[PDB]
Ligand binder design. Sequence first.
Ligand SMILES: *[C@@H]1O[C@H](CO)[C@@H](O[C@@H]2O[C@H](CO)[C@@H](O[C@@H]3O[C@H](CO)[C@@H](O)[C@H](O[C@H]4O[C@H](CO)[C@@H](O)[C@H](O)[C@@H]4O)[C@@H]3O)[C@H](O)[C@H]2NC(C)=O)[C@H](O)[C@H]1NC(C)=O
Ligand SMILES: *[C@@H]1O[C@H](CO)[C@@H](O[C@@H]2O[C@H](CO)[C@@H](O[C@@H]3O[C@H](CO)[C@@H](O)[C@H](O)[C@@H]3O)[C@H](O)[C@H]2NC(C)=O)[C@H](O)[C@H]1NC(C)=O
Ligand SMILES: *[C@@H]1O[C@H](CO[C@@H]2O[C@@H](C)[C@@H](O)[C@@H](O)[C@@H]2O)[C@@H](O[C@@H]2O[C@H](CO)[C@@H](O)[C@H](O)[C@H]2NC(C)=O)[C@H](O)[C@H]1NC(C)=O
Ligand SMILES: *[C@@H]1O[C@H](CO[C@@H]2O[C@@H](C)[C@@H](O)[C@@H](O)[C@@H]2O)[C@@H](O[C@@H]2O[C@H](CO)[C@@H](O)[C@H](O)[C@H]2NC(C)=O)[C@H](O)[C@H]1NC(C)=O
Ligand SMILES: *[C@@H]1O[C@H](CO)[C@@H](O[C@@H]2O[C@H](CO)[C@@H](O)[C@H](O)[C@H]2NC(C)=O)[C@H](O)[C@H]1NC(C)=O
Ligand SMILES: [Cl-]
Ligand SMILES: [Cl-]
Ligand SMILES: [Cl-]
Ligand SMILES: [Cl-]
Ligand SMILES: [Cl-]
Ligand SMILES: [Cl-]
Ligand SMILES: [Cl-]
Ligand SMILES: [Cl-]
Length: 845
Amino acid sequence: QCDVPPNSRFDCAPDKAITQEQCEARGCCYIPAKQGQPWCFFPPSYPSYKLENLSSSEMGYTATLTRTTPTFFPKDILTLRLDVMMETENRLHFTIKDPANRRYEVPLETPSPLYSVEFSEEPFGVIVHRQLDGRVLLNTTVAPLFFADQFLQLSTSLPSQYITGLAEHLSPLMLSTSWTRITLWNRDLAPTPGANLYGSHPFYLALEDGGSAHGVFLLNSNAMDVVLQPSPALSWRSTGGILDVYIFLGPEPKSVVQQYLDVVGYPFMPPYWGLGFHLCRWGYSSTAITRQVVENMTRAHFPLDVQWNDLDYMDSRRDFTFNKDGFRDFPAMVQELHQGGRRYMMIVDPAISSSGPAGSYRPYDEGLRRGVFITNETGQPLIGKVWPGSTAFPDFTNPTALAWWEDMVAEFHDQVPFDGMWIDMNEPSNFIRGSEDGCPNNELENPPYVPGVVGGTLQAATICASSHQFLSTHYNLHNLYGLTEAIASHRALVKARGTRPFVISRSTFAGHGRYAGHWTGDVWSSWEQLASSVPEILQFNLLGVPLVGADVCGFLGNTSEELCVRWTQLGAFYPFMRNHNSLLSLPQEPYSFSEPAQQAMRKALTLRYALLPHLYTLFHQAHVAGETVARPLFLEFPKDSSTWTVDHQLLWGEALLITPVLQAGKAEVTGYFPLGTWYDLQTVPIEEPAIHSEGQWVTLPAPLDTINVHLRAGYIIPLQGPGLTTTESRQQPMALAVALTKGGEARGELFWDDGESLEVLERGAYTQVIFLARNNTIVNELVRVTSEGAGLQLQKVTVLGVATAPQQVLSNGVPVSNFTYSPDTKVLDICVSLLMGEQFLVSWC
Ligand SMILES: *[C@@H]1O[C@H](CO)[C@@H](O[C@@H]2O[C@H](CO)[C@@H](O[C@@H]3O[C@H](CO)[C@@H](O)[C@H](O[C@H]4O[C@H](CO)[C@@H](O)[C@H](O)[C@@H]4O)[C@@H]3O)[C@H](O)[C@H]2NC(C)=O)[C@H](O)[C@H]1NC(C)=O
Ligand SMILES: *[C@@H]1O[C@H](CO)[C@@H](O[C@@H]2O[C@H](CO)[C@@H](O[C@@H]3O[C@H](CO)[C@@H](O)[C@H](O)[C@@H]3O)[C@H](O)[C@H]2NC(C)=O)[C@H](O)[C@H]1NC(C)=O
Ligand SMILES: *[C@@H]1O[C@H](CO[C@@H]2O[C@@H](C)[C@@H](O)[C@@H](O)[C@@H]2O)[C@@H](O[C@@H]2O[C@H](CO)[C@@H](O)[C@H](O)[C@H]2NC(C)=O)[C@H](O)[C@H]1NC(C)=O
Ligand SMILES: *[C@@H]1O[C@H](CO[C@@H]2O[C@@H](C)[C@@H](O)[C@@H](O)[C@@H]2O)[C@@H](O[C@@H]2O[C@H](CO)[C@@H](O)[C@H](O)[C@H]2NC(C)=O)[C@H](O)[C@H]1NC(C)=O
Ligand SMILES: *[C@@H]1O[C@H](CO)[C@@H](O[C@@H]2O[C@H](CO)[C@@H](O)[C@H](O)[C@H]2NC(C)=O)[C@H](O)[C@H]1NC(C)=O
Ligand SMILES: [Cl-]
Ligand SMILES: [Cl-]
Ligand SMILES: [Cl-]
Ligand SMILES: [Cl-]
Ligand SMILES: [Cl-]
Ligand SMILES: [Cl-]
Ligand SMILES: [Cl-]
Ligand SMILES: [Cl-]
């Protein structure tokens, strides 16, 4: 009975240190490890639930689950209901609930399948096969089902050692299965390994031998541990709610992500300007200093779309105010930014100063009157401590709080016309434990199982777990705090401005990308954090939050010039690109460095700006089809298993491979090149030529002034001319880069709209064009053409992989004004006067 191989031992004492005698008295097996792996573990006979009265419906299956012998946790729910819903050919959904009591559930809006589902009777389990090859994807029979009031555990075998997801943590893209405990409890902590960080996303994607994959989402917002072991297998261990489980069949990893996003929401479409460069620090302490940033960037020809402020603008660090010393003329500063074609962003905190004289601070006084705050045992506002001092915490599950937040945002916007909201401290972060008045002693504050959270308590760095919100207690709702503020702020900005919102949030939960973007928080200015930003940006793209990045050059500490060059090079490929800096750090704006470093930084921004029409098209694909913007090599080439562990390179979309230097003192880099021809993007004019790979590692020159970017053969990228803002760049002529296959084929596309309006796709207010290269011709195909796309000038076409110099180049049947061909690089560069919205044919021979 206790002959269980070491890797398949499931922990029977997750709750406390246990002796052999106590272990055996639990009905469990005791075998010390020989050097983590639990010593006390479940025999195959350990009491679980039994399946009874299974029946079938058009929808799927239902059954009763009964437990006869209590577990060692209090308040087992002995009778449960199983509902299995076979929702689409790719999505299976099951719930396990208490039929006798409504339990907390996360608020979320709603030929043969690829899966089959079977059941084990005793012990109970759910078994999910992939129909095509019979691979077992889920098998929950591997360990007991626990379902007690404050402890749910469900386990499964995994199909391979390769699993990604379960944000937010500082780790490789692929998670370690060597007895790893991953804790989801939103927490204000500077990113560091092994810790629960700012967000929680209870989703994983698991790879399968041969390159197929599936995904599993547990729709549960309670504090939870996910435990991975090397058999391989996984256990979800949550502290409340129900088991609400989705399985996404893929089979392609890209399809798994899209299917997940079909449930939680497709990413929101940002405004075009939001893809420009953003620049911020804590310490721009007046409007005069802040204006100097734009002046100094402009003088040195650095693009900058959006100027930001941190807390500096506020009156005594309070939301919806501005001080009358350094920021006396705040409204005029922001108006002037707009006059120059730029946008403005500033920090907003959730917590509202509660200490001012009554009647002197409207956000608090109104919030009090309307009952918008989270309250404590006696029904008064829970008071904690954040930047302004004593603060109350809005309850963004309360519809009245939603209205109050809309009003506060609209009123402040009437004074100062900011263009979005940077929402910070929304875990919610508390500088003291729980509240000024501590927390009561109850089961929510002191639960029977505490997940592996930093500080060993749910109260640490946050508010009391038993505090009251409109929908439920904070215990159940904590991991949604940031998300609910993001929803509230999205709506507030729609109402205040009437154009697309731009929200960047620290704390997140699954589905966040439907409303907002994210940055990775208070990362150190170190080579280590530069490198760790690549897997983290990739993770968030898999989780449907493509508008993500890290603070360029790092936030905490002092950057070095070399680090800031490399970070700016890589960071130009973050889908959200902002350089932000702490109060006590040395300056790190691009213009603050030496001339050579400035040149490298300028080149990085210039290239990003040239690529914006393409980056924006990629965001449109994310928004309409659940695609990723930045993606790991394995998403694009899953059938090449050498890609599975690669997380220090990234793709933009299908075709642009970025291979950054991530260490000090390097003048070369070694990166993986999937099967195909990869053209060096440096061979395209912007204002070894080709890697022929069999699927292999390649060492590339990478001096300080260089980042390696390659374009995949078969693809066409739209580009646009330069500007210091998107207001300027959007008016410039466009260009194509056309990467030919050996056989002469390529394809690409452009999506174009006005860059900020709401409901564009619903109203058809956009242009969509496909580009095709074939048989020594390049044409466009006009999927949709509207006024918004009209008048886009195409002035340059660059063709890569042209083997022989042409004797003639034609544009709509007329020999072109001029072209150049480089026999060394195989590049044909063609000057044209064409329109993206009008059918054209370019040819050469
Ligand atoms: C729920 O939240 C509310 C706030 O919304 C919270 O109210 C707070 O209650 C405490 C007392 O429980 C108040 O603290 C008092 O403040 C007064 C005046 O400043 C003092 O005179 C009081 O001193 C007493 O306690 C001292 C101990 O250090 C003794 O030495 C002294 O002799 C007094 O007996 C005391 O500090 C606090 O001011 C309010 N907060 C606000 C903003 O009004 C309430 O406690 C919360 N409820 C629960 C159950 O947590
Ligand atoms: C899902 O996982 C469960 C649990 O791991 C698997 O069920 C278990 O399968 C093993 C091996 O097939 C069984 O062990 C064997 O039992 C036979 C019969 O007595 C014995 O002769 C062998 O020595 C061996 O011990 C075990 O009985 C069985 N457990 C249960 C509860 O049924 C199951 O195979 C997995 N399902 C799939 C489709 O992979
Ligand atoms: C499993 O179901 C049986 C039978 O329930 C009957 O028909 C079902 C389709 C549904 O319509 C039920 O309402 C029915 O009762 C349960 O056994 C019955 O239990 C009731 C109440 O305890 C009793 O009066 C009947 O005599 C029982 N009938 C039989 C044939 O035994 C049984 O309790 C269910 N098991 C579990 C664990 O819930
Ligand atoms: C980041 O650097 C600041 C400033 O460092 C100073 O200026 C540099 C150009 C260089 O010449 C340094 O050696 C200088 O010390 C640090 O703040 C300083 O800290 C030191 C030591 O604690 C103190 O004596 C200075 O007075 C501080 N100066 C200022 C302007 O604050 C800061 O410590 C550095 N941060 C980290 C994490 O190392
Ligand atoms: C913008 O650039 C100006 C000019 O370089 C900076 O002003 C100088 O700052 C240095 C400090 O390093 C002083 O010693 C000089 O006296 C200043 N020169 C002038 C002409 O004022 C300014 O600090 C920069 N501002 C920002 C916000 O980066
Ligand atoms: Cl012992
Ligand atoms: Cl016990
Ligand atoms: Cl509830
Ligand atoms: Cl399949
Ligand atoms: Cl700081
Ligand atoms: Cl890698
Ligand atoms: Cl490197
Ligand atoms: Cl022409």
